[PDB]
Amino acid sequence: WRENFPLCGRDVARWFPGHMAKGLKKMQSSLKLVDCIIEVHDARIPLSGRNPLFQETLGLKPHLLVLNKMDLADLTEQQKIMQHLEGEGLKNVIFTNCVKDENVKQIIPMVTELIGRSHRYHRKENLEYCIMVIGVPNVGKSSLINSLRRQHLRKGKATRVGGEPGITRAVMSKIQVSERPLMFLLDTPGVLAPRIESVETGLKLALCGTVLDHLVGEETMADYLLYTLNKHQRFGYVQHYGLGSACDNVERVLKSVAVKLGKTQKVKVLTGTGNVNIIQPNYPAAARDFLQTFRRGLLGSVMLDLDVLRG
Template sequence: MRLAAGALRSFRERFDCAGRSVAAWFPGHMAKGLKNMKAKLRGIDCLVEVHDARLPLSGRNPHFQEALGIRPHLLVLNKMDLADLTQKQRILERLEKEGLRRILFTDCLRDENVKKVIPLVTELICTSQRYQRTENVEYCVMVIGVPNMGKSSLINSMRRLHLRKGKASRVGGEPGITRAVLTKIQVSERPLVFLLDTPGVLSPQIGSVETGLKLALCGAIRDHLVGEEMIADYLLYTLNRQQQFSYVERYGLPEPCDDVESVLKHIALQLGKTQRIKVLTGTGDVTVTAPSYSVAAYEFIRTFRKGALGKVMLD
């Protein structure tokens, strides 16, 4: 939902991160995960990096290139159904300037463009100067990326399309489902292709809190580590900046609003999510009914992740 130009209000030009730090947002198991991935590299022919199409230009882990960059590399920008791809050509040109030559947009839940993965991987492997086909009769591909971008969903989609088989990797709406480098999973018979699913690994040196918030919005960081209300505030800021006002109609607001407390209060009351709290006054404690802002924030974020608030680009 976009409003006519005359109906637009003045919104924030920048998001105030209020001196916050991302230091506490990164679980310690991630460093171990990257070390284990590097140890498996000897038997890997190609890397497939999966990232969120709503976040195509930031949030990727630069340590992948440092530790694993000696193999052919395909970047899969997943969840394309949730992204505003009107700037797709600009995105591709920007990524190509960064040295990425093979980029594919996919929707793994609907198997869209997933059939293109194996031909691209086969081409990358066979044209690589580093690849030696002396004895191997199979391809082994490592699937990498930050958490909750769809690595396991890609593997399961490929198995559905090429082998007519069910899930081999667990998937979920929260980061951290895959906690270890797994054994090889077959995804194709001809050519014979195996994939290694890996744990999502965030960079411990994200350049800014705002990049961290973008990752949190996409589900790469657990909500409680960042704070649901802060994530909801950044989502509101993003929607208003992009003139995406579908939240106004969805939650019955009178008009677009840039104050997250007002929006969350309205959502909480609409959902009937309130709580009884005690307030200390000069004459004693008084119990009042207050909206549950945390529940409303979770609802707001969850609706965005389902794509019900319109297609958004976070870069």
């Protein structure tokens, strides 16, 4: 297939509105009433999508790494993954499944130990523990809070959860998630880096749904996700869409998808005789459905940081 993805003329797709800048401002102010920091990140991109603006700005507190969405990620190289964070500077890495509440029960005992091996300073007399949840948008921060309440507090959903970026607009109030020990969680908006270090990282972030797909163009990551499937040699889309065989031509794949689902759109094409309205297969609809199917997990586990892991 294609040895490498063409990145000529493409820039990173940043998304830093004011709703997260004001939210990021609150974290510096609200740092006084927190004990531990938990960073929730997607397991599909354990290394690339992390926001550097969470270390030198917040800092000063124990840091816990929680890797969500294990079902959508391939954990064959799991041991090599944690070895990388250990070299990178992270000691506590936990994989979790928020939609199923897997491995969530081990968060609380480790969080208590991390706070114990620390200095609460003015919060020494507080029996209550306050934990702040951080990460990029759409990684399951709100789902993590609800999962902890269901497992420990045995209560209902307390934070709104959606499949769209920017569900949690601002820093919510403290929400109890457990009784033994008595401890709350702070729901915070997802914060992206104002400047993405590499174009490939931006596409990876767009692949997992952390950023809006429309501002990047549904076609560019349809090919990119098709490119990654070919690299992994999974070919889960071949039998899902009833395609004849694995292909690399992005336009032809979307043509089959539009044919398969009977989606057609009429567009204006600039000809030498003027503008002509013709009906064509609905490529944006095909791209959106193809992207949604991968996100739902019907195309198998993926790992977007395999190349950076090997070197």
